[PDB]
Design an enzyme around this catalytic site. Structure first.
Site, PDB file in Angstrom:
ATOM      1  N   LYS A 111       0.864  -1.186   0.141  1.00 11.05           N
ATOM      2  CA  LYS A 111       0.032   0.153   0.105  1.00 11.05           C
ATOM      3  C   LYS A 111       0.953   1.061   0.059  1.00 11.05           C
ATOM      4  O   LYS A 111       0.884   2.166  -0.782  1.00 11.05           O
ATOM      5  N   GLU A 144       0.854   4.284  11.176  1.00 13.92           N
ATOM      6  CA  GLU A 144       1.697   3.288  10.106  1.00 13.92           C
ATOM      7  C   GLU A 144       3.006   3.010  11.121  1.00 13.92           C
ATOM      8  O   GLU A 144       3.510   4.039  11.745  1.00 13.92           O
ATOM      9  N   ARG A 145       3.577   1.951  10.666  1.00 14.25           N
ATOM     10  CA  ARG A 145       4.628   1.387  11.366  1.00 14.25           C
ATOM     11  C   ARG A 145       5.805   2.202  11.445  1.00 14.25           C
ATOM     12  O   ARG A 145       6.115   2.974  10.677  1.00 14.25           O
TER      13      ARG A 145
END
Lengths: 85, 53, 469, 83, 470
Positions: C157, C183-184
């Site tokens: 993504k 988000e990471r």
């Protein structure tokens, strides 16, 4: 619409989409903390829509032929026609 | 010669078809089973949510 | 005003305060409990009365001693905005997480803002081309548009977004906003490194990208109002600096997801397939605070994580409503090895037309769509029978479609490392030409493997020579 | 699983069918991914291991269309792949 | 004004709670009237919550209601008017003529919560209704006093079917009929009113051998539940007090279910499967049990049922499926084939659809028809993949007969003079039995398939054979 009908005018009303009304009534009902209806839509949606839809008509000749036409629109959110709305 | 080859080919083809159909059966079986479970879960949740209120 | 209170309850990170004085700070006012960890910012979300408000708490609520004093800082949290935020990575409390020290800002603005009015709309029609074949053919961009991907589990993504940043944001001189919600940490590190490396973060200079990055470890409440902060930065450029911008938001499923968690705790009947009963309204406000004003036009990209790949879940469903183009990415198409993994039967844009992108473009696309639908229809038949057991006429179509499917994979440049294959970027005009030829069956003489993972038509020819050896 | 996948980098899906079918352990390579893990690759083992994923996704494709006729080049890939 | 004065306490939609004064309490299923410049709102008492606070359901709209509004108590279960001057006018739920044929000239009034007859009262059926409709007559003969059920899709000429039935059977019958329409279009209502004035059954220069109670969908759900009950009580007056047999007609009973499901939810009952009321069974049951052939009369209900998304696996249709005695399935596919009847012939079943009772010949003929069609359907799969040509001679003759029979089941209708224009055809029962026997024997296998298509009886089939021939 009734103003058209009253005038005896021929007119057409598109109600696009009733589905978003249902979401609104869901939100509204659940934040009036009324018990969740079928498929999370309060059970009186049928009354809401039915009353709405019968207010478009080809009226009597007495009523000067107030011909409001209705086209409701339901956008199938899965093609699930057995969904409550 | 032709007819024998034709009818034999028809036999062969129809055999391989049966195998392919079995695989599709298995694939739809898993789908069926999962789908059945998901419906049950979704229905249960609705009832529970109603009950909770 | 010194509005003292006590913390009556700490039910999750949805602290409840009971203000001592009878004065009530309004909904979306802010309170600071000066924690032994610094301060904790809380935001009024309900008034439950008796001077007991119920407040969402942005940061973590561990350690709290029930009956702990609060003081009200009032109003919506004020982020710091300015031209001097370009190249700053900011938390959500308005503090630089890239630790460039106190953000130089003239004006600090409240996170809450109202979506611009119907009368203040100015609505696009601009062409913007990405040079990605599938994108160009199926769903053209527009400068101001809101495009959205409906990808799986971060299944490149991010990779898709990175490609867009690489192309579009070096072709847009106007500012650009990266807001990465939940988000990471690793993804953030990659971006920080990559942006600095490609100089977009000029550290010596000033950038032309600004960043808000919100890690997925962050407590739900913080993640919820990450969006509002980004929208404020965006508004500052869009409105108050005027300048055309860009915006990236990923993962906006996390916005919905966070909301559902807090909703239950807030005391709402969390129904709506578990989602907050305010999901539509919240999404609406967010996606209309992303809008094309008479002033600035912000090309926006919003990334939805389809939850368990259930696109039919209401949260993806209502996102489609608040977008103008979509590029649903499916796990199946990824498995087919097609990079880009964009669904060719599940993309739409209001920019595709015979009068918008021309009749030739539309005609070419029309045939492609129909052909692929035929192929998809015969996916059943091929498996059940054989491909020689379906019509010769159809078999040509099917073979053509197999070629088209393979042709559509254009090597990624940002993931050129990861794929290994050198990236390919093909001009939009070139793309139309290439597909036109294929539709006329010109290159149906050369391998399917030649079509797989290559760029333009010329490249197919060259790879035919490679294969021929 | 999906919730985990979005957080993690790569997947190491194992195929049960393959597990039964003598690859023990059986590392499914369709559903084994590595996101940014290739910075690990020791340069010798980057060089020698060059394009092996591509090759075994040619073995996967080749054996996809093996089941009939194959050109000697594809057969060579299948023979190499199986081996 | 009763000293049983209650003040509204909570308007939460249809649920309206009233606060009757100390000691004074009504009773479950009673009727409260609240005088308003919008007539008298009728509230049906449905619970007591005690402390002289009752919880009642509204029938008329609840807009503008003032919380604390004085409530008179009628004191008893909603009592409609019944008579033979109820014949020939459209009477709304609150017992008021909405066609303005002046005030109903009531003889008696009765509650709408009249109790169903006892086991002793019931008089065992044996009468055979015949509608002059070939599919009905042959493949699922109806019985007088029956509980005919038009399960079908959404208005799939469902209304059209009812119109035909009224056109033939009602007029033929000397007795009254009661046409009750629950939640059907008010456009459709005006057409029905005009149409049945046209068929003269409603004669406004005379009496009428039918009464109408049209409750339409734009009325609150609570009122929708008791449209059925209201109509039912008139039928009981006919059955009992006038003694005359009738043929009740109700439309659509899914609306009766849907309405009840909705106010159950409002009443706070935990929704059952697919959100249906837990009291669904008993509500259906009360309605059905009330309708019966007694030693005072006979009442032949024809109840339209809308089967959502044509799924009879849906619990609401399935529950009704048990509760009725003479089922009919109206399939969309058959409509699309252009056949009107739209009936699924294998799926038609009726209480009377016996062997000897329908006649040995009739039974045998029908057994042969069923087998022929069942075979044709079975062979459809064989034809689909293998092809038509891989069938046997015996099978080919069966296929040829089946296609002919399929189009011989087609019988024009008077109510498809507004469709096709083609005048209806109605074939007497004895004639149908004879004619079908011949076809099966292959005496009319010398007649083209299209010469059965959309034409009536054997005489017509032969005539259309001649017509096509030249």
């Amino acid at each position: 619409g009734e103003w058209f009908r009253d005038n005896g005018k021929h007119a057409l009303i598109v109600y696009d989409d009733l589905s978003k009304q249902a979401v609104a009534y869901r939100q509204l009902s659940l934040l009036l903390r009324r018990p969740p209806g079928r498929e999370a839509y309060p059970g009186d949606v049928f009354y809401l829509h039915s009353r709405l839809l019968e207010r478009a008509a080809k009226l009597s000749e007495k009523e000067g032929s107030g011909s409001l036409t209705a086209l409701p629109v339901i956008e199938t959110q899965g093609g699930d026609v057995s969904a409550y709305i | 010669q032709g007819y024998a080859a034709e009818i034999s080919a028809r036999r062969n083809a129809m055999d391989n078809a049966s195998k392919n159909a079995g695989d599709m059966i298995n694939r739809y079986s898993i789908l069926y089973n999962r789908t059945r479970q998901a419906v049950i879960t979704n229905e249960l949740v609705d009832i529970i949510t109603g009950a909770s209120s | 005003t010194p509005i003292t209170g006590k913390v009556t309850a700490v039910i999750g990170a949805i602290v409840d305060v009971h203000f001592e004085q009878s004065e009530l700070p309004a909904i979306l006012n802010a309170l600071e409990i000066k924690t032994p960890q610094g301060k904790l910012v809380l935001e009024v979300a309900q008034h439950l009365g008796e001077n007991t408000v119920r407040t969402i708490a942005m940061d973590g609520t561990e350690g709290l001693v029930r009956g702990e004093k609060v003081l009200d800082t009032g109003g919506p949290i004020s982020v710091p905005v300015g031209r001097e935020t370009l190249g700053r990575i900011i938390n959500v409390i308005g503090e630089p997480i890239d630790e460039r020290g106190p953000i130089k800002s003239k004006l600090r603005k409240p996170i809450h803002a109202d979506p611009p009015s119907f009368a203040e709309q100015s609505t696009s029609a601009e062409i913007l081309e990405t040079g990605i074949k599938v994108v160009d053919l199926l769903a053209p961009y527009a400068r101001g548009g809101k495009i959205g991907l409906f990808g799986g589990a971060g299944v490149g993504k991010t990779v898709f977004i990175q490609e867009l940043i690489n192309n579009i944001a070096k072709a847009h001189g106007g500012f650009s906003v990266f807001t990465g919600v939940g988000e990471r940490t690793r993804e953030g590190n990659d971006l920080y490194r990559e942006m600095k490396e490609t100089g977009v973060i000029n550290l010596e200079g000033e950038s032309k990208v600004a960043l808000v990055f919100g890690q997925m470890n962050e407590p739900p409440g913080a993640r919820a109002r990450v969006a509002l902060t980004g929208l404020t930065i965006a508004e500052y450029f869009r409105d108050e600096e005027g300048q055309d911008v860009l915006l990236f938001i990923d993962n906006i499923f996390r916005f919905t997801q966070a909301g559902s968690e807090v909703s239950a705790l807030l005391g709402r009947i969390p129904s709506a397939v578990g989602y907050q009963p305010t999901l539509a309204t919240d999404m609406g406000l967010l996606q209309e605070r992303i809008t094309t004003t008479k002033k600035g036009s912000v090309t926006s990209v919003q990334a939805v994580y389809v939850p368990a790949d259930d696109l039919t879940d209401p949260a993806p469903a209502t996102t489609f409503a608040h977008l103008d183009a979509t590029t649903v990415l499916s796990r199946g198409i990824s498995e087919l090895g097609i990079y880009p993994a964009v669904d060719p039967l599940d993309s739409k844009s209001r920019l595709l037309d015979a009068a918008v992108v021309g009749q030739e473009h539309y005609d070419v696309a029309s045939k492609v769509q129909e052909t692929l639908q035929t192929y998809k229809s015969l996916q059943d038949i091929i498996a059940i029978l054989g491909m020689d057991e379906l019509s010769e006429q159809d078999k040509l179509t099917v073979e053509r479609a197999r070629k088209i499917q393979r042709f559509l994979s254009q090597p990624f440049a940002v993931a050129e490392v990861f794929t290994g294959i050198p990236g390919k970027l093909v001009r939009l005009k070139d793309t139309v030409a290439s597909f036109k030829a294929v539709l006329e069956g010109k290159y149906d003489n050369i391998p399917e493997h030649a079509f797989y993972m290559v760029g333009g038509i010329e490249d197919v020819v060259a790879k035919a020579e490679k294969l021929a050896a | 699983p999906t919730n985990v996948i979005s957080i993690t980098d790569g997947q190491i899906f194992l195929e049960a069918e393959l597990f039964y079918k003598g690859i023990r352990p059986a590392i499914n390579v369709g559903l084994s991914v590595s996101r940014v893990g290739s910075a690990a690759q020791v340069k010798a083992l980057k060089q020698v291991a060059g394009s092996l994923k591509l090759f075994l996704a040619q073995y996967r494709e080749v054996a996809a269309f093996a089941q009939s006729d194959l050109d000697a080049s594809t057969k060579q890939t299948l023979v190499r792949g199986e081996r």
